[model samples]
Target: SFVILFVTPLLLLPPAKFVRCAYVIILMAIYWCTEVIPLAVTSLMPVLLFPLFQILDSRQVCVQYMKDTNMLFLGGLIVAVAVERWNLHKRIALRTLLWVGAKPARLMLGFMGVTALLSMWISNTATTAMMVPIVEAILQQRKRLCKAMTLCICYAASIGGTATLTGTGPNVVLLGQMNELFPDSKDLVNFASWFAFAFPNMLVMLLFAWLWLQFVYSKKNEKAALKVLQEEYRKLGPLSFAEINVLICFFLLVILWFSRDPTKYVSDATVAIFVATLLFIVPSQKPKYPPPLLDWKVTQEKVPWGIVLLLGGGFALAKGSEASGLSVWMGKQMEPLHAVPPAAITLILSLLVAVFTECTSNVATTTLFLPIFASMSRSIGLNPLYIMLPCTLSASFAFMLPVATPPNAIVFTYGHLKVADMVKTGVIMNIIGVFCVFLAVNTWGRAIFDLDHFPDWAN
Candidate 1:
């Protein structure tokens, strides 16, 4: 409703072209936030507005919607779908839990570790949903452990999702935004580099999360919890051939995807597509039905075309923002922030996004903020990832409320948790996440990405 009121003032500003791009961005942000229009639909504002405003040629803008990063994401999703097709994700989750053993504290760690590990490849919501019933079946007798287990799954899913580019929506969005902001640095950020930076950071947080839960929720009667876990593991019987097949394909894909430094020989997308294609060629021998490891019908239905559109829309917007000088102009507006240290900016932005994400979509938050951080990093003479990476990671760090993430809401439906319980834990975790991200980015991340001096690729 405020669209016209918001646009009229910007139109009157100098540099009519940049203002027009800003107008489109604000309108899309409103629609993205209000959902008066579908988020994907709002993303298309650039396709229409950019050409109308003469910000960029129609052809150039259209190409922005389907960058190599988009294809990389698509290939990753296809493999995820293939895994879902065989229920391989479930088998992996159960097997991991069985291996971790089940003292009350270890049970919580196992549940979270498996949830996190699964989330690294599949959707976090699915991971949490699959794990919840298993957790419930095992810990039904202990109310306190039930709450801890439930919260553990939710928190771990979010933490685990931070580890991989394909692990969650926001990380994918970060890739698109990075591609848009630094086309020259395409080789700089890749699956391998992202995992190298993120996995270690994720593990540190997972450790802190585990220690935090054990400290607050540990019970003396650990023996019963272990027995319950063993019983549940026994009930799964044995793994199916289908599970073993899917695991082989999945691990091979991961190994190949991460094996070489990106562009040293093959791009990440090339490896992903090659592996995804193998799913169709690999044979499965079942007497009832003979299908490949992945069925095309199921994949078509499950692949999130909406997310593809959303990714495209974000890339288009970033293109229009740059084409119209809006990104650079906005970068100039952020000059004052240079007074603050890069580490402080990282911590502040991490906390800010974490708080806002408690009430908004993590993907949307990342899409909206990435351009700003990209601009800020340039204006302040810092590497774009220096600020942007932590901000993206923080998007999944929301922990305060049931509404914060799908995993959080799914776990809360058990009725074992109160809002107060979540708040007490979430606040601490948010602070811990901010500190850890800031520290990691400056230290470990710095070494990987070479953050101390801006890379020539960024130029």
Candidate 2:
């Protein structure tokens, strides 16, 4: 810490505020990676350090935590929690699994397909939690397949989140930062636009993961091994009133989220809160006997309040970085890369964040790197979307370690996997994902975000 604060700055000789911002970033990075403090606690350092270092005032930094994008995330989680409470997520998963036949490869694909689809609307952790036990029960007799099934749930959950802006915390943070840097482009970054670009990327990665898991783990023919899954699926019976209500609300929420704000009417955040509100007011068959679709008790127990704080910390850091000119200063440090083509710069940025995220929090990684990428794009005469979008996608590419993601850690707890097992598969995934993100962003992302040439709106 002392070397970063005193010695390193002497050599670089940045402005005092930039130096101070750098100090806080280094401190937060260390604690975030090690988790010496809770990630949310480490995130709070920016609130304290930024004001003390004269980077930003307390009120200015505090507002970043409560932005509409963050609230959209909270609202989404509330709806997701309600879905879980009523077992709607389970019925959906079982039905999806039942459709994919009882072959080894088919089973893996089915698990991943359901996991990915659920994750696009709900929390990745919850999606994985719902799928893990189901996969375990179906694949228990096939000991060799357990590891592969475990990896699929973890990998697919992360990949599934890439499809929507509100699907993952990092994606939401990316949207927040996009609005912070380029307010005019909000229309371009809306639900329909983000889905147009990111959903295809999700499918490509999901296919690759399904193929890879099948090849590395399965024998030539293992259809008989998965025959038990049919029995498991049959046990779910018919869907109930609560499940139907949650499903209706869920689809309605998705339609509202996608349809709104194309020409700019209602914000996605409002639609999210609006649907979440309906979950409570809309009654079930026996309102006097059973709980509502979303009761306060289930929500309080399940909603991840700490994650909200972690996000606030990240937003505060971005605010401080911009206010102190640290974002531009960091961009200036990368001015040497101006000569490099934008495509290669995109690949390098993707690769760096993908690896870094294997140890750090994805939200923190995206939050810390995005403002710097935004300023660097400006410094290098390219649209910020060209850099920031790929980097944001790459943050979810941490497949190597159990510590990399919650899904990974959840799968690891089953004792079916070792570090070496994950590393062997994850390294290939990391490389494949780097090129995939670069390809998606440069081609599809260009069309979706209208990045044929730099837009004046970016400035």
Candidate 3:
């Protein structure tokens, strides 16, 4: 099969202007075949092939496995466990339903608002875990609004997560890399700084996205979702003290998360680990055991090791690209594009990845292209984040497909919505998201912080 033949050259080839497109096509074909395989196994190719190609040594391949990324992921896992132990997320969701009032449309808006607001501070994974049921509540109660609200809630949480540095996994990964790439750059976007940068972007994205959802997804004659909510609400009864304590701890952790180092005492990751540990230490008297029993099953089984491996694979592959001097090779390939204005280049690259990601796997898209983009940014002398950050946010906006993101997958199970419907609604929101990212990172905050005076590497 040419699959074998095509993949062979791409594995060992040097960059040529005409061959880049061929390389990308071959890579996609390989990915299409491998995505159907077990993810961890499939992700291992770069780790294995890189050394074979003399791209990196064996030791270099293993470095990312135990990096701080694992520590932060573990800490986040622990906190997520603590939230589960307390049932805090449920109580918050329920309270949001009450606060947002009982109207279908208002409830939809309120859920989006709350999810976005909470996600801005916390991780989107956690935010989505909690908000899924709330959206379902609206769906079950006001079936008329279910189709629109559920998708909107998921999108809102994702978009809101992008509004802060720590709010999403990709952003966290990208932030660390940015620091690595430009260590000397002042006004490095920290956790607090990211929120400041993303707030207006979040507002604009949510506003436009909300309007888009209302227009595209709302149906006048659809059955009401209110009955579903009332029934679901009846099942939960009332919140217990156990849930309340869990929430208070999370709230404190969130506030403390933003105040790391110079302003405050601890890192957000540490705070999360501490809270998760407390689930074991602080016991509730339930029969023979504590109420909040730590689930090793969730810790071991639920956590997507495949995803972690995939991420590690991505990092390894990027390292390979750098080590093989593929970065410099790729940089040379992008030289022709540098003649274009920096602003035009930024907009084009940002939008390119943004639009492309909706129809494909964002993780794969990023894994394959981001290193090249980073190198391109260096070659073209543009601020890398100006291109990379927007692309990161675009990964989360895949409202068009069930396979796009986990939250979208979660929502799709509940409704009878089709693929085409998702595309119709999602494409507009995607455009809105692109604009917001452009305005936030490039226009307002960077200038205010005097980041316009960039290094020669970042024009």
Candidate 4:
């Protein structure tokens, strides 16, 4: 009777709906926390759980999922989609790699450095397998900072998104998640704050991934790769009037997002969709025929609809947590952590999240982890973003498995970054990633997020 009572116990805080909300939390968290089916598929539970439980009106629960950060994410991703459609990325990457090619690495420093800087070009090369052949050949011409550079660009792409809010799936999830968890935290985590906190984290992790890839793929000891960089360059041309329009669009899209007015009205979504829409409107000098930079047809294909639904699901779930008082209930459960130092709690969760992420979509990890973390910080009197920010950043630290992240999968398959090779090198990349998270949470991350002081809003 006691066990059964615990299973569906209606008495907690004396609200049946509180117990009811627990059911949705467990079902979604278990499924989302695992991959038995699409994580998004599990998201549909809100349609049933909240409505049936009478915890929220069915009509309202649907809108709970569509928070502004979802719009923010949508705006950013579409522009990224538009940018890739023009092939402008490769033009710059090829030109720039050859620029460094003339005077190579110390050699791994050049190899290890700049992966984060190179991240924008590496975006969504999910199966850009052509880069693989010449990656090998580039090493033929040069064992190569070119070689290490090749491996490390893939490394940097995953590291790249955390430094900015719109750039990746998880960071945006963090924004919406934190917003839902602490409704008063407005502008606490805009694009610039994220950049300040995580840019350094990106640099450190990128360097670590770079070092590990070189050590494992060491050309100093092993040899058999060389020369075909030219075959592929022959395939690319200087500047098409077609591509020039795209390059300019992307340039402003970034500049204005980062440099925009500090006046409160403009936001990531505003800046993002504005430029994203312009790309659809603007045409090339090939403009005589009036074809614009990107069309709905291409955006339709390239844009990831999965993240939209996923973001909705997360925002909805956090909303559910708010209504049930599940958040406050869970916050009290975290009182025990108050006995531990705040910085150590940051490290502990970083390790916990890294283990969860090294094999799953970080979008789910951040979504599921943040509410619990936000409440824990609330109850513990730690700044909510302190734990939440690192949780977001650490999910980016997936390097241990091909399934770790998309970029790793691309490199693992074509580079044949044998699973075994990934683990040996990836294990340290994991540590390095965690090390930087610790560094920031204990140090600069504190400054940017104000980790040392709890905000009154946390109340």
The best candidate in terms of TM-score: 2
All candidates: CA RMSD (Å): 3.1, 3.5, 4.6, 5.0
Give TM per candidate.
0.91, 0.92, 0.82, 0.87
Q: Quick one: ranking by TM-score, best first?
A: 2, 1, 4, 3
Regions more than 4 Å wrong, model 1: 1-15, 218-237, 262-265, 286-289
- lDDT for model 3 comes to 0.63
Runs of candidate 4 exceeding 4 Å displacement? 1-15, 102-115, 118-151, 218-227, 261-263
lDDT of 4: 0.70
The TM-score obtained by model 4 is 0.87
Cα lDDT for residue 351, candidate 3? 71
Give all candidates' CA lDDT scores.
Answer: 0.83, 0.82, 0.63, 0.70
Write the residue-wise lDDT of candidate 1 on 1-459 in tens digits.
Answer: 667644554465444889888877877776666566676776777888788888987898888887677888888889888887777777777667668766666777888888888999988887888888887777664566678888999899999999998898899899888778888886677888999999999999999998988877845445555666566667656777766777788888888878867425568888788888988877665556567878788889988877788888888888889888999899999879999988888888999999988886787788888998998998888898899899999999879988788899999999889999899999989998988888899889989988889867666
Among these predicted structures, which one has the highest lDDT?
A: 1
- The residue-level lDDT of candidate 2 at 16 comes to 84
Among all windows of ten consecutive residues in candidate 4, which has the lowest summed lDDT? 220-229
Q: What is the clash count for each candidate, in the order shown?
A: 0, 0, 14, 3
lDDT of 2 by residue, 7-106 (tens): 4533443348888888788778777776767888877887787788889888888777787778888888899888888778888787777677656667
Extract clashing residue pairs from model 4.
140-226, 140-227, 284-287
The residue-by-residue lDDT of candidate 3 on 1-459, one tens digit each, is 656644674565554422443343345436633454454565576656555555556788778554444455566556666665556655566666666665645766777888887776455666776778756544444343567866876788878877766466566556545533444544355555666667777888888888777776544222344454455567776666566666666666666656652342445456667766765555544344555545566667545566567666666655555555666777888878878986676667667766666555556666555666677778876667666766676655666676776667767776545677777777777777877777776777576444465454353
lDDT of 4 at 458: 88
- Candidate number that wins on TM-score, 2 or 3: 2
Better of 1 and 2 by lDDT: 1
